[PDB]
Design a binder for this molecule. Structure first.
Ligand SMILES: O=C([O-])C(=O)[O-]
Ligand SMILES: O=C([O-])C(=O)[O-]
Lengths: 780, 780
């Protein structure tokens, strides 16, 4: 039995006293509220909040049986007897406590009939997780395929079809029961840790996500090289092998930005060396030269690191001396049996551990390391009696990787304030994106099932803050011989998901350059396409930094009033304009694409489709996967380069997909130096905008640029605008009022300013796009 | 009747007095003698000699009936009565005067029975010109195909199967009669000008050419961009069209280094504007921006210029005021009716004309022009009564273009001492290569016959000093629709001849980017190959600067004791290692290749051929032309780039064609900054050497580098050495004494240091080639 006794509004937080203790309510924004139970006691701080101490001005109103604590859009309705809080956006009930807070810690909420619930982070259970129960305990799931209730990167958070996000702001071993045990009850449980939750509301899914990232953190724009081709395997055994792989990309003519070194860089065996955190000079004899030589070819070097320091490693004595490792209750360094050997864990929650670990990253970065890979951050093994500075293993578990990213992010920004950190990790917490965390979906099997699960995983993570979630392309775990068709499909999908990083255990090659001729003939133009598409992808990344909008969006964004779409885990949007349907089984001869109502074009073949709702059936081929372009799309391209270090936009090629059904369309292209972490905040960019206005007798484009520009920005770009499905009735073109004839033949064989290709229904305009506004008007 | 009267030896020249006048003999080297008749009178100076005032120490000996004037290798034997000079190398008679000098000026020599005679410069008559008579008067031959006795660039010089070169060092309207009128008489004639000839000897064809260029001039190494892809037509009509063409290369993914602007850059019509020598702002409104924008994309701009200033042009009044034009006997500017209109000719032989013309080049170069095209330098029209500073038109005619190149070369070196001039001209004289002249074979027809004549022309010019002779690829003149198969064959041949410059009248596209899909699919990888092969071509260019060795060599170099080979005009060597046989007729299904005795490989298919003399029959296909690689060849490649401005050799791929028949082989790769005119003289280069030693049980490679290097030179190059026709019996590899196992599987699918591919008979070695010597030893 719990009931209201009294409250105090100051400041600007509401502090309620019940017969069972204090509860603190604070708005972190007009759309998000933090609710802290046991507010009177010492607890771990928030991890989910970017500004935990925030509390914006809200209004409090009182009635006989209720209190109301209201922000701009979100309202908390506090029922006095019995005590229960419920949350409203406008006058719409979003979520209501049932028993609310109990005591172990326990939160119980009602679920509404028909309410669909995404969330929990990485699970393979179906997009709607209602009817499921699972632990909140980051844990490896080696070789997973088509099912998992628990893997590397869980999130103690859900997104509802009612368009709210609920966060359990607790870092401890726990569980989530989404109407499994009791049909109408959502239950959150933890063995210890912070007793708080955060509710965020929105009026649309994009707004919800914008509001969520506003209070949990926005991802800083990654370096542009993060969008390029990575060479990776587990693992290059030597400097010679590493150099030979960089060379193979050059001689096979595949783009390459970054080569990634797994654990052999610090030891010749898988076991026994972890913690050395320094070069194995027997096998990597001249690493500074190696990294400098790669830099000369525009190629970055990334090294793997782990939380564990083995007692057999060269740094054990020093880590103990430094007090860098987590301790046992007795006060000794805690050592335990990992796969790799007996060892301890670096206490990133401590001053000593952070300083010690950070110094090592600084040293290696100074030697030439450009980016960082942190593996096993669950932590993969984490005995319950391990003691960190701020609590035992079970209490801090799901925040270890989160703090590790914060430590590394701060370290990198301190060392290189003019560069954007690259931090790729396996496990984090709500908000880890604010430290630039780029997660991957762990040690996936080399099976079709492993591939078929990746869209579900990516969308689940993307919706709750992680735009750069991706997979080991081609599959990672076990296998005895390459499944060629699977590999090809995986690397094709790879082009249209956030990070292009094929990676697998090295008894089977993961890099595309080591594949057979047919495989390379298929993949080479696609890896090149990835680079040609950089303006499209980098612009989506820019939007992700601005608003949290994920690069991969679920089908359900297309119709927010159709909750059934939430179940779709087979087609997704890559940016605004491409509907992608990966092939995830062998021998598939055709696909049924649930394209939203409207006009769509085959990305590969230019075929125009129109639909009022019924799905579209497309045949498959081995060299592509099915991708449809939304009518009204501006698809921007630059010439392929081998490395983003050579990126130039002096030449732009833009394809506009015209249809009268889209009378107004807009496109944008974000350009900056690809590297300045402050480019957005300081307006050091060149933002290109395109607007199409399509009427019965005219099609006109308005082109403009804003921003203060940047060093090396082109003043004038040669631009080729290719209008697909263009009318054969346009007689003339005006550019800023100057009338120009449209040629009707030989468009590919003359340097024509404007030409219509009747066989392709494409109208091509070639012009100079300078700093002043440009208007191009086509008229019948 | 002519007889000896007396002589005087000083100094170090021999001055002979006959009853008819004085004759001066001077050795310009140990292998070359200048013979000047009428030595007592004022004459035009030598044009052919790089150091006209040279006279090395020779020995004079006298007998009753003879004088002997001898240098290191060449001896002049002077018979006293009747007077006649003959020339000997060792004790071998090379050439004997018949009547020798007469008076118009006339030289008569005996030809030996069976002696074959190349020479005369551009003619289409057969490689051996003996039995032919033709004028020495540079003259246009618009639309030539398969025959010409007189075209743009004649040379008053011959090369004999006796291995001497004879130069008629005379610039005037003349003629050459090579045993036509009289079977055993070579006759040289001129209406006026210098009465001198130069004989150069050698002990082999390469030595002869080395000796010839020693005294006539060596070509300075061109900028590396001269070896790249040129966009050209007659002609881009506007800045917009020019920019659109640069853009088309970018969007079609063809390499492009340079775009070339024909006469529309200075006027909207073909007639009436020549002499404006300034931008037509109506059609090229922002040329400084245009050139700067191209430079940002690594693309150079070259402009056409001509000798003629029309009375209708904007510069007529000023040229007259400056006294820049040739005059009539009366002293007025000489005006005459050219195709383009009434106009005069710039007197490049005068101080005033040179200063005036040079100032105009300086101005345009300062604006951003990177290289220069001088058309119509025959001069195309040149009335006999035109007076230049040093003589009338007929007297100086064949040296006009020569002096024009000298003027421009000096101008460019004065303006940009740290760059190599690019000067492309149609007409010159013996020695013009010393001013960097890059000639092309004029306005060739768009016919198979026009293509079929190009090897003959190129070889004739190459042998007598012009390594960069090339053709308007695809054909230039007339035509009404593209002959697609002809065009393709011409641009394929283009890859294996000195300058890659498709160019034609613009009613049919000359650029490969404006061709149909099939044409582009065929040509794109070949234009890319041109760039991948830059280390091979640029190294041949280096050798040409060093020794005069032409880039294209005739088949007859392969066996100097087989004079019948001299007739071959259908196969030639591109550098040392490639025997190329262009396809020069439609529908050819196979070719008979007269490969020299030895082992040869199909460049495209790796097929091994062996022959003891009989020709090799190869089938043709549309995507290649037949090219054989000589066993022992080291073929070096770098990754394709879009422009030589981006050239890097951090990654090398070298293919060695092994065969036991070649127990010793050598290769070299010349690397410098691609631009420094002084790189060779100052040793600012990186010269890579490879030596193969192939015995019954071992194959070993010795790799080394010399030179002082240059700014940006890579210290360490990732190198992939691919050994073709490698034994399947090599068990191990030592690199500098460190033994390494050779893998026997999965060579394309692993980062192996050494791997043998049994199906391809290729052994691949991947390693780091640093500054120290490297020895790689394979042993059975
Ligand atoms: O858009 C149009 O009107 C057309 O396609 O003709
Ligand atoms: O060269 C060899 O000896 C061979 O091919 O086995």
């Amino acid at each position: 039995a719990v009931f209201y006794k009294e409250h105090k509004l100051r400041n600007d937080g509401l502090v309620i006293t019940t017969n069972q203790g204090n509860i603190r309510l604070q708005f972190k924004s007009e759309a998000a509220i933090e609710v802290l139970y046991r507010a009177d006691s010492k607890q771990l701080p928030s991890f989910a909040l970017a500004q935990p101490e925030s509390a914006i001005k809200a209004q409090l109103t009182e009635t006989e049986n209720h209190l109301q604590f209201s922000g701009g859009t979100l309202t908390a309705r506090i029922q006095k007897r019995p005590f229960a809080i419920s949350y409203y956006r406008d006058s719409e009930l979003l979520l209501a406590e049932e028993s609310g807070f109990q005591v172990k810690i326990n939160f119980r909420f009602y679920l509404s009939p028909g309410e669909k619930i995404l969330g929990g982070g990485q699970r393979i259970l179906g997009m709607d997780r209602r009817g499921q129960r699972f632990p909140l305990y980051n844990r490896a799931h080696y070789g997973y395929s088509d099912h998992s209730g628990q893997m590397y990167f869980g999130l103690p958070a859900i997104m509802s079809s009612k368009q709210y996000i609920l966060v359990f702001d607790n870092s401890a071993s726990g569980a989530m029961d989404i109407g499994k045990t009791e049909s109408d009850i959502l239950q959150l449980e933890a063995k210890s840790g912070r007793s708080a939750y955060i509710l965020v509301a929105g009026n649309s899914y994009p707004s919800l996500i914008e509001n969520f990232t506003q209070v949990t953190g926005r991802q800083p724009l990654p370096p542009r090289w993060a969008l390029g081709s990575f060479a990776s395997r587990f693992g290059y055994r030597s400097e010679a092998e590493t150099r030979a792989t960089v060379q193979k990309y050059k001689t096979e003519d595949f783009p390459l930005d970054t080569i990634v070194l797994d654990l052999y860089w610090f030891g010749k065996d898988i076991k026994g060396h972890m913690g050395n955190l320094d070069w194995d000079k027997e096998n990597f004899p001249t690493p500074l030269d190696m990294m400098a030589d790669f830099k000369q070819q525009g190629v970055k070097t990334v090294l793997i690191t782990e939380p564990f320091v083995l007692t057999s490693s060269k740094r054990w004595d020093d880590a103990v001396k430094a007090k860098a490792l987590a301790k046992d209750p007795q006060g000794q360094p805690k050592a335990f049996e990992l796969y790799f050997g007996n060892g301890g864990i670096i206490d990133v929650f401590s001053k000593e551990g952070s300083r010690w670990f950070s110094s090592i990253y600084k040293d290696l970065s100074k030697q030439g390391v450009a980016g960082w890979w942190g593996d096993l951050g669950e932590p993969e093994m984490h005995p319950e009696d391990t003691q960190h500075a701020i609590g035992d293993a079970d209490t801090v578990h799901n925040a270890y990787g989160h703090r590790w990213a914060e430590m590394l992010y701060q370290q990198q920004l301190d060392q290189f304030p003019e560069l954007r950190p690259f931090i790729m990790m396996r496990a984090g917490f709500v908000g880890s994106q604010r430290y630039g965390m780029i997660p991957w979906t762990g040690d996936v099997s080399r099976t079709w099932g492993g591939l078929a699960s990746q869209v579900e995983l990516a969308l689940q993570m993307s919706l709750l803050g992680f735009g750069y979630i991706h997979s080991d392309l081609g599959g990672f775990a076990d296998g005895e011989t390459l499944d060629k068709e699977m590999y090809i499909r995986w690397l094709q999908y790879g082009v249209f998901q956030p990070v292009y990083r094929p990676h697998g255990q090295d008894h089977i090659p993961s890099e595309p350059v080591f594949q057979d001729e047919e495989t390379k003939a298929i993949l080479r133009p696609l890896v090149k396409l990835r680079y040609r598409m950089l303006p499209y992808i980098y612009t989506a990344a820019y939007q992700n930094t601005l608003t949290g909008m994920p690069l991969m969006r679920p089908l359900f964004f297309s119709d927010e009033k159709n909750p059934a779409l939430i179940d779709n885990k087979t087609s997704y949007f890559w940016g605004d304009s491409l509907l992608v349907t990966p092939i995830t089984q062998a021998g598939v001869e055709s696909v049924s694409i649930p394209a939203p109502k409207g006009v769509w074009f085959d990305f590969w073949k230019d075929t125009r489709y129109q639909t009022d709702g019924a799905p579209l059936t497309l045949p498959t081929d081995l060299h592509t996967i099915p991708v449809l372009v939304k009518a009204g799309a501006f698809m921007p391209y630059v010439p392929a380069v081998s490395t983003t270090e050579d990126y130039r936009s002096d030449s732009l090629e833009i394809h506009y997909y015209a249809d009268a059904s889209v009378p107004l369309a807009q496109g944008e292209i974000f350009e900056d130096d690809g590297k300045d972490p402050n480019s957005i905040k300081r307006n050091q960019f060149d933002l290109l905008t395109l607007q199409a206005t399509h009427t019965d007798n005219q099609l006109h484009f308005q082109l403009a640029r804003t921003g203060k520009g940047y060093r090396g920005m082109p003043e004038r770009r040669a631009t080729t605008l290719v209008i697909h499905n263009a009318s054969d009735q346009y007689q003339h073109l005006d550019i800023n009022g100057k009338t120009i004839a449209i040629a009707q033949a030989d468009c590919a064989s003359t340097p024509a300013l404007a030409c219509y290709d009747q066989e392709r229904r494409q109208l091509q305009l070639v012009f100079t796009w300078g700093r002043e506004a440009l208007n191009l008007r086509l008229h019948k």
